[PDB]
Homo-oligomer: A and B are copies of this chain.
Amino acid sequence: MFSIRKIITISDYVTMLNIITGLLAILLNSFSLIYLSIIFDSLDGYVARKTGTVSDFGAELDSISDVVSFGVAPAYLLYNNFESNLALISAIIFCLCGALRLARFGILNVKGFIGLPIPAGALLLVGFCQLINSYLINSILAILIGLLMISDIKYPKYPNKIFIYIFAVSLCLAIVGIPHFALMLCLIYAIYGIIKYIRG
């Protein structure tokens, strides 16, 4: 009675490690594990394509992992660490905005992103929460990120190898308590998207 076992691919195990790291970010109150979740979220689609184990089941599991790691966990990390009515409302809006763009992304098959992608949104909020000691500013930022995530601002999907290279390293630095470089790279990505949008 565990016929589900015949649908699991090797890339699905990468996705489950992502679900584990995203859940443990909440359970253990760990910003560090958010950064690791971004790494696994990049690794699981890569493994699927390289091993030839792409599947509809895995595509769904990948999105479900995003809910955990990048919708719920950052909203929890905001409220847990900046406990306040404003952080409560903002965590709600953040999580809701993550949910809405994942549902839109789930019915879309376009080559870029429409709105800021949810791992970028999660990175911004978590980096802000670690380096800004103000519940008010961080609660404002959560809303701004939420609005960016459900927006029509176009964002590119494939950073070239140079950007991958230095972003990968910045994420591991963030895992070990130095998130500045990852947050700065992620801000440049987000802000450039907005400027292009306003400029036309």
Chain A residues at the B interface, C-beta cutoff of 8 Å:
1-4, 7-8, 16, 19-20, 23-24, 26-27, 56-58, 60-61, 63-65, 67-68, 71-72, 75-76, 79-80, 88, 91-92, 95-96, 99-104, 106-107, 115, 147, 150-153, 197
Name the B residues within 8 Å of A72 (CB-CB): 23, 26, 67-68, 72
Further contacts, 19 of them, CB under 8 A, given A64-B71, A67-B67: A1-B151, A1-B152, A1-B197, A2-B151, A3-B152, A4-B100, A4-B104, A4-B115, A8-B100, A16-B96, A20-B92, A23-B76, A23-B91, A23-B92, A27-B80, A57-B106, A60-B107, A61-B103, A64-B99
Whose C-beta in chain B lies nearest to the C-beta of A7?
Answer: B104
Given contact pairs A96-B20, A99-B64, A150-B4, A104 touches B27 in the complex (Cβ within 8 A): no
CA A64 to CA B61, docked complex, whole Å? 11
Given contact pairs A61-B99, A68-B95, A2 touches B150 in the complex (Cβ within 8 A): yes
Given contact pairs A72-B72, A104-B57, A27 touches B91 in the complex (Cβ within 8 A): yes
Whole-angstrom distance between the Cβ of A134 and the nearest chain B Cβ: 19
Copies in the complex: 2
Which listed residue, B56, B61, B95, B153, touches A23 by the CB 8 Å rule? B95
Which 5 pairs show the lowest CB-CB distances between chains A and B? A60-B103, A1-B152, A60-B106, A61-B103, A67-B67
Name the B residues within 8 Å of A150 (CB-CB): 2, 4
Whole-angstrom distance between the Cβ of A143 and the nearest chain B Cβ: 14
* Cβ A57 vs Cβ B23 within 8 A: no
* Cβ B1 vs Cβ A153 within 8 A: yes
* Cβ A88 vs Cβ B152 within 8 A: no
Name the B residues within 8 Å of A91 (CB-CB): 23, 27
Whole-angstrom distance between the Cβ of A69 and the nearest chain B Cβ: 10
Given contact pairs A1-B197, A2-B150, A19 touches B68 in the complex (Cβ within 8 A): no
CA A4 to CA B104, docked complex, whole Å? 8
